[PDB]
Structure formats: structure tokens, C-alpha cells
Amino acid sequence: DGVGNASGDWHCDSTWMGDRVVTKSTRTWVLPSYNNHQYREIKSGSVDGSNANAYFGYSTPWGYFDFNRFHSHWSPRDWQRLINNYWGFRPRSLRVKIFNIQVKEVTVQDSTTTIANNLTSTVQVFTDDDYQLPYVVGNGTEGCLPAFPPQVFTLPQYGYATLNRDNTENPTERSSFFCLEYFPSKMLRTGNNFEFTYNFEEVPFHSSFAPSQNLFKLANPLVDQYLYRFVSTNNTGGVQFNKNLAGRYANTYKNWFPGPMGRTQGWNLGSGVNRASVSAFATTNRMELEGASYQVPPQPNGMTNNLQGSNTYALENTMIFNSQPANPGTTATYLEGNMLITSESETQPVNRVAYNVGGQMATNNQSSTTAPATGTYNLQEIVPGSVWMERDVYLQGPIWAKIPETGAHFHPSPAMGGFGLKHPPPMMLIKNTPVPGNITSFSDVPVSSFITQYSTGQVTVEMEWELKKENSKRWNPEIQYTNNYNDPQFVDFAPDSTGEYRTTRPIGTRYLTRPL
Amino acid sequence: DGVGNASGDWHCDSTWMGDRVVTKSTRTWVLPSYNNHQYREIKSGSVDGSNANAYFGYSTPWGYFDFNRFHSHWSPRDWQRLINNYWGFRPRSLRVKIFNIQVKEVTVQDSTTTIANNLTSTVQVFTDDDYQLPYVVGNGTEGCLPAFPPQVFTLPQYGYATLNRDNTENPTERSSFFCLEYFPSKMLRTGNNFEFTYNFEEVPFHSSFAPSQNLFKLANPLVDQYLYRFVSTNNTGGVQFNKNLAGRYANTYKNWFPGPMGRTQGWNLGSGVNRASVSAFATTNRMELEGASYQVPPQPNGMTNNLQGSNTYALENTMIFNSQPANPGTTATYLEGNMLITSESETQPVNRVAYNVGGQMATNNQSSTTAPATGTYNLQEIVPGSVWMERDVYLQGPIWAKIPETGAHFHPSPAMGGFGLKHPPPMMLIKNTPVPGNITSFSDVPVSSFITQYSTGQVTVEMEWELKKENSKRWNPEIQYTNNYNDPQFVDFAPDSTGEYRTTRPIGTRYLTRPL
Amino acid sequence: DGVGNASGDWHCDSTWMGDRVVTKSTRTWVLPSYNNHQYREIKSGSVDGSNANAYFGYSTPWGYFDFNRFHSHWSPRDWQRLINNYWGFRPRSLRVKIFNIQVKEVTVQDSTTTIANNLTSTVQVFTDDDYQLPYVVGNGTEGCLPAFPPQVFTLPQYGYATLNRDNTENPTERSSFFCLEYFPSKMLRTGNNFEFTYNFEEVPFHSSFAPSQNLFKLANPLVDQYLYRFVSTNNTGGVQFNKNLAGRYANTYKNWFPGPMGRTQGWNLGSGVNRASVSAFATTNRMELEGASYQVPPQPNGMTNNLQGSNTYALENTMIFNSQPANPGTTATYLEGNMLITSESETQPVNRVAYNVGGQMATNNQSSTTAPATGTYNLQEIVPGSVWMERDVYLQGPIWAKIPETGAHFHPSPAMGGFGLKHPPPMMLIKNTPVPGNITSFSDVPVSSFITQYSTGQVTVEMEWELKKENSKRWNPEIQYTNNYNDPQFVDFAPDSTGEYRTTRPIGTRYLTRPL
Numbered sequence A, B, C: 001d002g003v004g005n006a007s008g009d010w011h012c013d014s015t016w017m018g019d020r021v022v023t024k025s026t027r028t029w030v031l032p033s034y035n036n037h038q039y040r041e042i043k044s045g046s047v048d049g050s051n052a053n054a055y056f057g058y059s060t061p062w063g064y065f066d067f068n069r070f071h072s073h074w075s076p077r078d079w080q081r082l083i084n085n086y087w088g089f090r091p092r093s094l095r096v097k098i099f100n101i102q103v104k105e106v107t108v109q110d111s112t113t114t115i116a117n118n119l120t121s122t123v124q125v126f127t128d129d130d131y132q133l134p135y136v137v138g139n140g141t142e143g144c145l146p147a148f149p150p151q152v153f154t155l156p157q158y159g160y161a162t163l164n165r166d167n168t169e170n171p172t173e174r175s176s177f178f179c180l181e182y183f184p185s186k187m188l189r190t191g192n193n194f195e196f197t198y199n200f201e202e203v204p205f206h207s208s209f210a211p212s213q214n215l216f217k218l219a220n221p222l223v224d225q226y227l228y229r230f231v232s233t234n235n236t237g238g239v240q241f242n243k244n245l246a247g248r249y250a251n252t253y254k255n256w257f258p259g260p261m262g263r264t265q266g267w268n269l270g271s272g273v274n275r276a277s278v279s280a281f282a283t284t285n286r287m288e289l290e291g292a293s294y295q296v297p298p299q300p301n302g303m304t305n306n307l308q309g310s311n312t313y314a315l316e317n318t319m320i321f322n323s324q325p326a327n328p329g330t331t332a333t334y335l336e337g338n339m340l341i342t343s344e345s346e347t348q349p350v351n352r353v354a355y356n357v358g359g360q361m362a363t364n365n366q367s368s369t370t371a372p373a374t375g376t377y378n379l380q381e382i383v384p385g386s387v388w389m390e391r392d393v394y395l396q397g398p399i400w401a402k403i404p405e406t407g408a409h410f411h412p413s414p415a416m417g418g419f420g421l422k423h424p425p426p427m428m429l430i431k432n433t434p435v436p437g438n439i440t441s442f443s444d445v446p447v448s449s450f451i452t453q454y455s456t457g458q459v460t461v462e463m464e465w466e467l468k469k470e471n472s473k474r475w476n477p478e479i480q481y482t483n484n485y486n487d488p489q490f491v492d493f494a495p496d497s498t499g500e501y502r503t504t505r506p507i508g509t510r511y512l513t514r515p516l
């Protein structure tokens, strides 16, 4: 309504009400006027010897709002609270509000560089509710709301990648260009604000519990089966079998089978033992798409890295986050120390080991002359009677991802973990309306010189989650996430002398135990 | 109400009413007071050279009611009746009742060992309706209701297996212990009884019919296709094709594809021909889970063993039951004779042969210098346009199995055949309340000496099944299960001189024929 | 109603409903017919060189029901659940039921010793609702309901201690004798049962949280005080002062003062360092009552043992429980290992160190000739502006205790921790009605020979607790009780191979953090 009046109050809070909890988090932000208010055609030929890095696309002046990161909404304890006493959760509804828009104009004379605000200028927000733009938000890229309410953050620029021709930079006749100014968008001078309201589609509860039974040894030990297994051949080519018995769990008919597997090699950590001076890329797991070899991280789930105990990890199949945020374009080498590496060990009983072969099966036809032989297999895909656990979500991990448009998706859980959404939280685009510099002469060609200015405002995301009440009959105490350190010299998830937020370790959600 | 009065009448019966039939079967049972009313920690290190047999779990004083075995509810003829004129069936509802509880106390002096009944003592029944305990019943273990109403049977002890550490006996911090006395349970002295009422979740009709068409040669022979296939290359590297024609069924575009396959080797039976003195285990098919190789029986369905005709069987992929019940802990070798072995030949046209390679595909890129080459594959998993038949259920086979708790199950049919249930018939636990011996001095430590006593009562299971009315236009008579023997010297499915129930052969359900 | 019918169903369960949770636990029990149905005058002269052990009292045939022990109602996890996410709790209501009474009669011929049940005999239960009997239950004695539902336990005999004359065994004219048969009590043959209903008086929530601020350094560091302190004297006897400043927390006016203290000496544990071959008794803390020195355990709270970190413990001031139950009358020496020792370190910031002096104050009057002097004090009692935390309750610790009858109690929290109740859960007395042997001749003297018989039945205690919802604004994750072990070789709070319940460690309730 007026320049003087606050566009909105500041809400940050967690409200636990029965079976559902709602998280409101508000933060402050800056929007540079990227690209000086013009689109740039952007492309890249193969780099580091890989045509897989070749792409053709565009860069826009628009910045976008990303909150698809659990820790944007959850405080550490709140996370803890959720992960220690709940069997699952899914996000039901979401509402966003952008306010307190303040736009500033900077002018530099002889390197003076002063910042003063014009009140006249506007900002533009619109939400792509019909998913007509490329959806960038699903793919684990920087720029989400901080995990720490205080810290101010700068909005990521919006750019998308269309299809390359022939793993060269060049475009193809099918490649398309999207203009963001084609959608109608609200324009906000300082008095005004934006409110976004949303309702999540129905998705299965993320299963935040670990199996207390091993899949194969489901059957009670006490009683033998009524089925028998082939065991040997008498001296004449005659078949003989024995009863499956009691405890033995190797030779017992099974009803259900582990998850889809594809070996990705295991590397030791800590004490370790790894091969020396090794170039990782040649031996990484990959999928060939459009005649180029692409690395696939988080090899599609149905597998596990680490067994608890031993340090070996399926690095190809694993989620790794920096301890602290770092910078754009960094090429610096990182040792194990800095990294927050994650173990899928909790999901190990249901899931298969990623650095072991998946099993073996007979490779020959037996005969009088010739004995039976078997062959191990490094990759078993999906089968009926399958059963597995999808990868755990982390306080630091992403929340959801958009399902690609195609005729079919096999049942889909983002390989990076989270909620597979057909219709996910809409792209939220915002840009600073351009203000022309001093233009004194008319031309047909478009204006090229602009006043340089950026915007800053606050934004609040309010989310509603539904919970699966914990209900177990387990007698003894379950393991839970404890803030347990010995001889600490600083708090975890807390500012330091310098003032920066410190996060020591990643946090899964699997602590509670459910028998199969 | 009173010691003298019967807690319940005896119901055994089959009622066929239109499209649905209800089976009531009642039997008699004994419940030993296992473990002298205490839990035992039970574990096993690797045996027979396999860490797969390593497990950590517990044994309870509770016995359980298992009826998950088709022949508990169906008399032979009734089975027959169902299998010869129906295209499918699923269980809609179930109701159970336990009554006529009689508890007896045995005392032995100088080896006298007398049995007299105390009327004062109780028994405990409760049903785990919320699936909070490990579900043992799904996994084809002994102790179900007899197939023969007269025979008295002893209730299986309840024990479950939690997760092992490192394929050693030892437990893990995630391993959980369940106390059965934590659930509230009805206590029954002799006058009282138990009634259980249940409603099955909706499941697809088990398809009890065999295809009368071969999958690939679906198209009518009379007419050629309007598509053509590449056939050869002219002397210059030039492509040439011919019309697909008429009857030929090898080279004709196909819309649908066979089921998932994984070779498990074939062994001859009867006349046979098998390799001599062979140790089966090295060459068995297996899956690696938690860093141990486990054998998987009934290799997940989508495959067949036997083609009719020839005796070769996919033993790894097959269902084998003893002819007669046998004993706990038996290690005796069994020849073919005793076994009731099953052929999935009826499902052969839709399904793939288990001891053959699944097919072949090109393994090289053709060039002027270099000719095209192909490679057979021993394991093909799931694909779009797939189609297969799940394994047939047997009078002797199990009915249902519980789906494991995880984020996803690919469409699941118990590998052992039956109905995949998310929420299956609840574990039914019963135990004898302990009666202290003579205790004359107080101690803080728990009482250790008990009166020795066991319980016996009857129980009835009443089930309602829905049927898919047979409706075919097949002119000529279909094959049906006939009780056909030549020169019989005893009846089948009938007592003998000794008094024991004799079952000669297994009985599938596929007899009726449905064109695709 | 009838011998045959169950007097009551078995309820064991924990129901969490919003702000209040209700715990139902049911167990089995035995009641020996103590004393052959007669009272015994019992007394003791000084033993182990202490007249403090001298007492005069009586022993009854009655056994009593004790559940005043947290772990009787809480399963491990349930405890956990409560202690990790709640700021407090108090018991609002309680209801008890005794049923399934079974009375047995034992006869021995030539050492045969058979147990058969007579159905005719009765049992007697009554509750002393008017607190007219000596209340024994408050004082941490054996015989409470087991922590493990399965285990059967024997009811403690009821005996009370009246006043001794002169620290000799002999009675005094003021000493009184209570006859339990004077109260009217329900008599129960096997068909019948007992129901007890109760409502707790209003008591402050047990504060289950640890202070995140140190009492003395409450004031913010950033700002100095506006008060100044005397610091020195100029060379002439002149007073000079400095401003209290900033961070310094030693010399800053304080509003609130630590808790009441009385030094009890500190002993090292683990690595330790303690004096060798030491007789503990001479140097133990004590209070003189009726001209005898009595040891006081749990020296009245307002103090702490242990500071976290260092192993030294105020053993006199500490709660120690055996790892496993042990036996009546044991004199066996116990090393540290067996013991579950407790640290009040969480309450350390508010509370005072027990093995340090409490402080110091000036002991002289300063003059020109003579400098000021100070003296440490080993015991400071209560003062206005006091503030402290009462000792934490343990899964293994007792729940409540009865306040003694006198004109005044200073604000009272059982020194053993728990709820100080003016009117606590009534003594629940039960005894087996005596059955005369064969008496063939009349006498005036009371019958002396009885049939020997004992009773066994189940009992259920149902409690309702109110909770203080956790509500904190602490950003970083709080510490919580985790079931965290490394290289476990058995589960904790779970049966072992032998069948006995294993409890490794004690569990406080202070995990959550509240700033002052």
C-alpha cells in the first residue's frame, strides 16, 4: 500500500500438532539484475575429454526461488524430533509469500560506487504453475534457502539446457527457446507483496525406519520347512534331496527377493587400503544416452553402500555433501575430511551390497560327461517379487524432484532420494524490471544501456507435513540420533568465532526399527 | 460359561453357492508349554560352510496358528471341483474360532508320568492385527493345520530372526527384541473361547487356466503382415528385405514379450542322464545380500521348469514337497520317488524355459571389413510389453504371503505362488499361562520352577472365496484332473492299514484352457 | 462367577494420547503363606557394631503389592520416548486389578512333595486407604513388579518396624502393634477378582531437563553492571572499588544462590586413584537420631555427584543399583563393574559439587593491625533466594514416597527422588486364608497345625501420566538417549541364552535442555 509500511511480518517457526506438523521458515535474499536484462545463448563443446559435457541452452535475467532442500524448513532439533519418533512423513501443502521488496540503484563515479534506493522501480514475480518451462529445481543445484535463518543469500540465476546436436555445442531444429516474459507476472513496487498457495499431490510416506529382520531369514528358526531341496546325485546319475531345516537360512525356499543391483566399485575410507594414484573416471559406472557416455551418480536405488562396520563405500552409489558451502567454479581437490559421506547401511538388510556381485546362476547344461557350472552376475535389474528400500533423505538432502514427461515411468523414486512428483512445487521466477539509463536519441534498435540496480527482500515458505505415528512393540530401546560428542571444542550446527554456520555431519532419518 | 459345557460345536464343511464358495475346516491341536515359559536368545554361526546360515534372534513360549496352506481348507474333491470348472479365485473373508480349551498337568514320580487336568489354569490368545511382530507365517514352514480333519497336530513354536552382525551370530545395535506379553491378550479358562473375524484386501484372481495359444504365434497364419524385415545385404553393402509371410512365426513383428528369465540348470528325471556324483551347492543360483551368497528357491517367477514331454526340470526353479510329512531336523537323503515334483509346463507358452538361454542380441557393430555377431544371454529381467504367468498354487501349496515393509515393491506375487498381501491374516499367538510350582521362600529373582502342563483344544477356520465363472467357447473337451490310476493297490488321499494319510501326487490348478 | 471362567483379561500396553499417556502393565505373582498364618515378634540388637541397626517390630502373614518403581510401568523404548521429547511428567491417576486367583495345596509323603489345587480356599485383599498402617512401600525395598512382563515374581512379606527402646531390641510403652485382620478385606475364591481405583493428589511436574545456562553467569557477557565492588585498600586504610565488568562472572552481583550442601567425600572410578584398603564406615556422612548415628544415603538433595568428565563420585550422595537382581541376605562384595552408578552431572550447573567445600566467608574483624581472613565451610543449609534441582528419577528408580506425619515438612522431595505424596498409593495387602489340618479334638488354645498351601494369580496396574509438552527455541540438536553400543555381543534390556533379563546401564531423564 505504501513505501513506508512493511509488506509482511517475519515468520519462522515449527508447530507440532498431533499427526501433522507445519514448518514456517523465512529468510532474506538478494537479486542481482543478471545479464543486464538480456538473454544469452550459452553452449559448451566437450570438456575434460567428454562430449557428455556438451550442451546448448540459454541464460535468463530471471532468478528463481529454490527451497527443495530439507534443511531449509527444519531446524536441527526439529529434524531430530521427527527422525527419532516417526515412521514416515510426506508434505501435504505449501504456501509461499514474498514481501518487503526493496530495490536499490548503484552508481559509481571515479570508483566511488554508492548504493542509494529508487522507490519507483519494480520487480517481477510469477509462478509457472503449468510446468511449461524447463524444471531446473529438481536436480540438486546450489542456491536454496540457507539452513540458518539469519544468513542472507543470493538468488540463483535461471538458465536451462536444451538438446545439443551430436554432442557438439550446436543446436538442433527440435531445440526450443523459452521466453520468460511471455508468462504474465505480477509487478511489485516496494509497498506490494506476493502470496503463493499450493497443494501437494498424494505420495507414499517416505519410510523412515530400518528393518529389524533380514529379508532372507524371515522364517522362524524353530521350524523346518515342508519343502525339500535338491542336494546331490548318487553315483549313477540319480537325484537326491534333503529337507530344508530349522535355522538354516541359506537353503530355504524364499518368497521375496532383494532390490535391483548394478556393481559400482567399493573404496575404503579412514584406515582404508585403496590403490594409489588412481584416475577415477575411466572406471566409473555409466549409461550411454544419445551416443555419449554419461556418469550416473546415486546409481538408481535398490542398492546400498557400506555394511556398517567396514569403511568401504560405494562412492559411485552414495550421497556426498561438502561440510561447508564453498564457491562457484571451484576445482579444488577435497580429501575425505571435508566431506559428509553417507551410509545406506540401515537399509542394508532389504537392499543389496553395491560392491559385491549380485549373485550367481547356472551357465551350462549338465550331462553324464559334463558337470554343472555357475556364473556370477554384476547387474540384476527388476523382477516380480522384488522388494527394496529407496535411499534415505537427509537434513541436507533435497525434498522432491519432478517426473520427466514421457509415456511411462517405472515406479519412480528420485535416485537422489525424496518425493517423485508428477506435478511439483512450481518454478518461482523473479526478475528486476529494467530501468533505461539516459536515452536522448530514438533508435529502432533496442535500448542497450541501463541503470544498474539490484533488489533485496524477504521471503517465507510455509509447509505442512503429515506423519506416520510411530507404533512398535519392540521391547528394548531403539537407537536414536543423539548429539553425542566427546571432548567438543565447538557446538555442532552453530555459528563459530568467525560467525559462519558449522555443520559437522549428515543426518539420515532411519533410526526407528520395524520388523518386516 | 462352565467347565462342563462345550465351548463350541465342530464345523467342517464346503458350501458351494453360485459365484462364491465358503470352506469351514475344524481340527484338534496341542500346545506344549515351550521353553518352560521363558525367552531364549538363539543364534547360529555359519554352518555347512555358509555364513548365509548365520542369524540372531529369539524363541518364545508362544505357539502360533498357521493355516496358510490350501489343503487345510480344501478336501481333495473340493479342490478338484474348483480346479476343473473355474478360471480363478481369491479369498474374500476369513473368520476363526478357538474353543474347547482343555489344560492338563503332568507329574512324574519314579518314571510314572501321569496326566491329570487342572481346570483352574488359563491359556492366552491374541492376534497381532497391526503387524507389529515379525511375520513368520508367509514363508512355507511346517506346522499348518493337517489336510486330514481327523489327525491331531501340535502347534509350531513362535520364534523370529533379527539381523546378524557380519554374517556372524552376534547381534547389531539395530537388531530388536519383541516381547509377546506386551500385547494385551484374552485369557481363557476351560469354559471360555476365542472368535476372530477378518476381511481380505482386494487382490487379483489367481489365474487358474492354461493358454491355448503360443504367445509369439498369436497372429493368424492365413494373412501376411504389412511390415517387412531386413533379410540380407547385396554384394555391395546394400540392404534388402522381404515381406513377413503367412504362417511363418519366427520372422513376424511381435507386440508382446515373454517373462523375466534367469537360467537355473536343468536336471533329467526318470530315465534321466544326469552327471554322476555331483555336489549341487557350488552351481546353484544365488543372490548376494549383506555380503553373503544366499540360495533363492523358486527363482522369481516369469519362468518355467519342464516343457511337458521331457523329464528335465529346473530344480532350482521348482516346487518340491515330500510325499509324507517326515520329521524335524531330518538329514536323510531323498531319491526322486518320495518327492512330489511340479511342472510349470501348463504356463510354458506364456513363460520362458528356465534351463535354456533367454535369447540373443547383437554384440558388435557391423562394417565393410567386419561381419555382424550375436551373443546369447542367460538372464533377462523385466521390460515394457512384458507378459508372463505366475506360478500355480497347489492343494499342498501355501495360500498367501506378507509383503515386506519398504518404500517400493515391484508388482509382487510371492515367488512361492499365492496371494501377495500388504495386510495378511494376522499372526495368531497362543501360549499356556505359567503356573508356579511350590514356592515357599520369597526372592527378588524371578521364579524358575513351574508346574509342567500342556493344553489341547480344537480350532476352526472358516473362509470365503470368490470365483471367476468359467466361460469359454472352446468346442472340444478340455483336460481335467481325473483320479485315474491303473492297477491301484491303495486309494489316493486316504488312510492306509497303518492309519496314516497317503498323498501320491501334487495338484496344480491349471486345467482349463483360455486363448490369449 | 465360576471356577472355570477367567477372572480377567491380560492387559499390558502403552498408549500415548496427546499431552497425557497411560501405562497398563500386567504381571504374574506367587503368595507363600508366610509364617504359617501367625504374627511373629521380631527384633534385633546392634549388629556390625552399630546400635542404629537395633529395632523392634512385627512380621505378618500378609504379602503386599509394590509397583513403586518406574520400570514396572515403562518399557525401555517407552522410557526413552518420554525422556527424549518431554520436559516433565506427573502421575494423575491409577487403577489396579487382581484376578485369576488360583490357590494350590502341597502335600509331601516320604519326600514326594506334590502340588494339587483345592478350589474351596480363599485369599484376602484389602487396601489401607486411610493410611492407618505403617507405610513400608516408600523406602526402596525389594519385591516390586518385574521390569519384564514375562517373569513371575513372589510377593514381599509385610513387616513393619516400631520404635526400639534405647537402641536395644526391647520395645517401649509407646510402641504399637497393628493387626492386619482388623481391617475388613474382600475374600476371593477362584472365580472372584479385585478392582482398585485411585486419584493422585496434585504434585509439581518432575523437571526432566538440564539447564543450558550456568546459574552464576546468567547475566549477558556483553554489558557491565551498574554496581561496583570493593576491591582494595589504599596505603592509608582507605576503601577503593572497581566496576563489575562485562564477561567476568566471578565478581558480579548475583540474584540467586545454589542449593543446600553437605560434603560427602569423593571417590575415583575407572582409572581412579583411591586410598588402599579403606574401611568406609568410620568416615561416612551421618545424622544422629535418638542417640545413635545413622547413615543417610542420597544426602538430602540440593547437591550433585560427578561433574561429567572426571570419575570422582559422591558415593554417599549417589544412587546405586545392582545390574541384576541378586538374592536376599547376600553379603558378597561387589566391584564397580556389576554396579549401575548414576551421575547427577546434568543437574550440576544449578546444583553444588558434593565433594568440594561449599564456599568460604570471612572469619575475623579487620583492623589497622590485623588483616581480613576467611574460612571455608563444609556444610551450608537452606537460604532465601535458594534454587536447586532435585535428583533425577531412573527407569530403575522408585516413583513416589509417603510424607511422614508431623506438624511440618520443609518442602519435601524424597531424597531418593520421585514424588513426595501426602496421600500416596495405599498399601495393598493380600494373604492366604488359613485352612486347618485335620483337627479331631477341641481345645481352647488356638489351632496350630494348618494345611500348607500357596496362591498364585495375575495382577494389573494401570497408570495415567500427564506430560509437559517440550517447547524450546534451541537451534542446535539436543543430546538424547541413544541405544548406542560398539561391538555389541548381546542386546541390552533383553533376555540372554539362559533366559534372564539383562540391563546394562541406568537411565536418567535429563536429556533435553532448558535455558534458565
Ligand code: NA
Residues within 6 Å of the ligand: A034, A035
Ligand atoms: Na552474469
Ligand code: NA
Residues within 6 Å of the ligand: A199, A200, A201, A423
Ligand atoms: Na497439484
Ligand code: NA
Residues within 6 Å of the ligand: A332, A333, A334
Ligand atoms: Na581444500
Ligand code: NA
Residues within 6 Å of the ligand: B034, B035
Ligand atoms: Na523347546
Ligand code: NA
Residues within 6 Å of the ligand: B199, B200, B201, B423
Ligand atoms: Na485389512
Ligand code: NA
Residues within 6 Å of the ligand: B332, B333, B334
Ligand atoms: Na528315505
Ligand code: NA
Residues within 6 Å of the ligand: C034, C035
Ligand atoms: Na518366613
Ligand code: NA
Residues within 6 Å of the ligand: C199, C200, C201, C423
Ligand atoms: Na487422594
Ligand code: NA
Residues within 6 Å of the ligand: C332, C333, C334
Ligand atoms: Na560378585
